[PDB]
């Protein structure tokens, strides 16, 4: 229960602080006490205690400090534990536009903190003497133990996937290359015909917009995901991707062009007030942003939107 997990987190901070005082005072560090404090090898509960800790702000806040006193095998086991349970985590449930269609500002902040800390940790683990087979194993754990599609309805799940595949791509035996093909295929099959769902619905965007007093959204992470999915696949995969997100391409082009006209009508006004000036700068920034993020994906496909057309590259 909640009071139990809170007591657990308290104990963990005490272990970390003792550990951190030792390292400062030059002397011995032994992470054995802190590791046990995590209850990572504890099957005695409904939800694993360490996992439940991750849905408290104070629990997630101590994760980097925990990783400072861990070896790679301990690091891997933790990430394995997490990847296993991803789509069940309370914070992921908060993160998905499906399970949480009307988040509060506070819930958005909790979500942002989680993905900020967790992603950085996962990234640093992959950037630090990590091999292909490690990454593959993590992707495969992700795919086989989760509703992959449900994960793609969260910024966190989407970002996690594109980090994993982009780290895969950025990297080797022939069986390893083949392993990547099998895994990509598994990932791809899990998403086939559900790709457009990565785009939250209009009701959700309107809600977020009203919430944050902002006329615009930021979906760079969505197009980034598509670009990396497309770059990691073969020509038939790319074909299937561009087909599933067809209407999103058109809608994006449509919005950009609507911005282009509003820009043209404000641009020719002399001595713009502060309000009109901030508005024009906003229009321009957002127009260019839609072009840029859309072209990140199209360029991968050998395509470009420029002067009212999707033309071939060069």
UniProtKB/Swiss-Prot annotation:
Location relative to the cell: Cytoplasm; Nucleus; Cytoplasm, P-body; Chromosome, Centromere, Kinetochore
Similarity-based family: Belongs to the PAT1 family.
Biological function: Activator of decapping that functions as a general and active mechanism of translational repression and required for P-body formation. First decay factor recruited to mRNA, at a time when the mRNA is still associated with translation factors. Subsequently, PAT1 recruits the hepta-heterodimer LSM1-LSM7 complex to P-bodies. In association with the LSM1-LSM7 complex, stabilizes the 3' terminus of mRNAs. This association is also required for mosaic virus genomic RNA translation.
UniProt miscellaneous comment: Present with 656 molecules/cell in log phase SD medium.
Organism: Saccharomyces cerevisiae (strain ATCC 204508 / S288c) (Baker's yeast)
Residues of the full protein shown: 474 to 796 of 796
Coiled-coil residue windows: none
Domain notes per entry: The region at residues 254 to 422 is required for stimulation of decapping. The region at residues 422 to 763 is required for PAT1 and LSM1 to accumulate in P-bodies and responsible for translation repression and P-body assembly.
Result of knocking out the encoding gene: Increases the level of stress-responsive gene mRNA during osmotic stress.
Self-association state and partner proteins as the record states: Associates with the 40S ribosomal subunit. Associates with the heptameric LSM1-LSM7 complex. Interacts directly with LSM2 and LSM3 within the LSM1-LSM7 complex. Interacts with DHH1, LSM1, LSM5, RPB4, RPB7 and with topoisomerase TOP2. Interacts with CDC33, PAB1, TIF4631 and TIF4632 in an RNA-dependent manner. Binds mRNAs.
The protein's name in its UniProt record: Deadenylation-dependent mRNA-decapping factor PAT1
